[PDB]
């Protein structure tokens, strides 16, 4: 069979990552309600649960 | 007339509002954006000659 016995899923490699994730142009930035801001720009936001990853 | 000083130490103190960690992160994200720069005059501004 040569190929791995179940298709991989997870994160992504650098070649896919650069074809995804093109720079985001945010017009009228921070205009809406909180809870609809682009929160996953924030480098320590735990996007699974709308909370920010502390040290504790 | 003989006055003198010595400095033994300098320390920097700083105090933080204990703001809720996702709220402060929501404020931070708003203030890191080029539409929202902080700005200030010299509070009684002139060129002094």
């Amino acid at each position: 069979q040569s190929s791995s016995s179940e298709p991989r899923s997870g994160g992504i490699g650098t070649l896919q990552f650069v074809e995804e994730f093109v720079p985001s142009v945010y017009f009228n930035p921070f205009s809406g309600s909180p809870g609809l801001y682009p929160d996953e720009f924030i480098p320590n936001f735990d996007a699974v649960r709308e909370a920010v990853d502390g040290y504790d | 007339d003989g006055a003198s000083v010595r400095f033994d130490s300098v320390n920097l103190y700083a105090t933080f509002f204990p703001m809720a960690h996702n709220t402060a992160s929501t404020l931070e994200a708003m203030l890191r954006n080029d539409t929202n720069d902080q700005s200030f005059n010299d509070y009684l501004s002139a060129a002094n000659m």
Partner: peptide
Amino acid sequence: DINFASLAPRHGTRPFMGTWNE
């Protein structure tokens, strides 16, 4: 001669303070 600051006031809501969309 030149003091200034952001101001378009509101008090505490029926919630009073801190939760900040109407």
